[PDB]
Amino acid sequence: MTEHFITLSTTEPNNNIGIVKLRHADVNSQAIVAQIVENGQPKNFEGLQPFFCLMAQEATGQGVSEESVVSFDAKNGTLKYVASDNALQFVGRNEAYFSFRKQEGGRWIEQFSTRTFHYIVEKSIYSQPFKDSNYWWTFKELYRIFNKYIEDGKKSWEQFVEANREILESIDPGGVLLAKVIDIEKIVNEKVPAGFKFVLEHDSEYQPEVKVTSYKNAIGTETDGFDSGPVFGGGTIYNVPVSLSYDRQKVYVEMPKSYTLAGDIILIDDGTLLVIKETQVLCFKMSDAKITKGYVFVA
């Protein structure tokens, strides 16, 4: 992360010497590394909690801006302050300093502070107001509204399905049956290997293990040519559940209904075969044997 080095004094009359300039968009990166010096020697603030005090323009009160510094070495008089959301909120030319206070039971005992240094915040693309849909907006405003739409939208959809499922299932003695049978069906059409059957002819006299995978927009299968698809090199790979049955030099691979694909059968030099239908590819990987022929089961 980005660091800003300062050697702040408590005796030397600086008042304005020392400039730290940051940007508005700087969540947890820009940190201030400060050395505390009193009469030319490093100051030990042992027992006194360091505080980042900021004197913001047109945002003043009793507690203008005060944040406890977490990273610090009181023995050598060194501290590290990472600029917070509050610190970066005030865009413009501001003044800041570091306080050190010891308190008994709420009330203060001792409080010494360093000289003032300039703390200026440069406007970002996110701080600058912009015109959208005939109105003036800042990023923080829209980003909150858009994420609300997503959050409340997901919750309202979750409730939409929940309420609708209670209608046919909770209000009917035989309606419970209806939904459960439909629900159990697609599980069987996607996860259970039954609906699709493919035959793989081999050279081996034994039982070779077959592994099946399904993926779309694979290398050189995209509609508008090479690297035209949304996910380069293949999208999501699904490990197809299989039920294996064997005959002499024949492997019957049973797969779910959802993986039914009738396309071009391509045989590669080794124990690998593909079924390609435009963008959808079904891959067959066979161990300890060589594929000679591949075709969809029909008898």
């Binding site: 080095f5 030397e12 009359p13 600086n14 008042n15 304005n16 010497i17 400039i19 300039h118």
Partner: protein
Amino acid sequence: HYRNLPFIPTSAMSYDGAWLEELIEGYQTLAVEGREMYSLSFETQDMQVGGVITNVKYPPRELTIKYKLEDRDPRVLQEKFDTLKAFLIRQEDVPIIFNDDLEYTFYGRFKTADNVAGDTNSIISSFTVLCSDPFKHGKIQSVKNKVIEVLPYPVKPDKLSFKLLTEGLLATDGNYRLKSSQAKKGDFLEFDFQTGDTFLNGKVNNNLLDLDSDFKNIRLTTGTDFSSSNYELTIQYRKAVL
């Protein structure tokens, strides 16, 4: 509500870290001239047609500062000047920073004060601050092996921290060659403090450290590279601007 707040103008001068307008009540910096534009010295050997430039020099610039000092009581006003002079008149060079140019830092000294009237009780005049080095220096930076920062002017370094790996030291960038025969081989630090003398590990070794054909007048450009497999060098420089 009444508070006697010290006013700090836009182009206020900070002599030796302190503001004069804060020091002396009634003082105010009106204008500061000479920093915005710099003039060069030229050596020319003219011939039949035209004339070739022998040498280009960088003269030490003086910054003329216009101030206003006022007080109702003439006795106090005299005492106010007595402090202004005591603060300005310095035997050694002093760091000067401006309120409008806070990044950079000049290094000069009070030279000549313009004629001052002996009436009114509200005086406005000026004084020059001769800067031995015409360059304003920014923050001090520690960079490893090579400088890749956009440097507007060639910069003389402040410290060169070398850490050997081979037998001898031979630092090069293409133009400057820094060489040290019979150096401390087997990972030993060698400080080359540009604004003083040379160091070996902890002890001061100014006389023997560098060889006869070594360089101490080295200057860093925007694309200076010293990176080598023989030494791990840490450059310490300050951006110089005119």
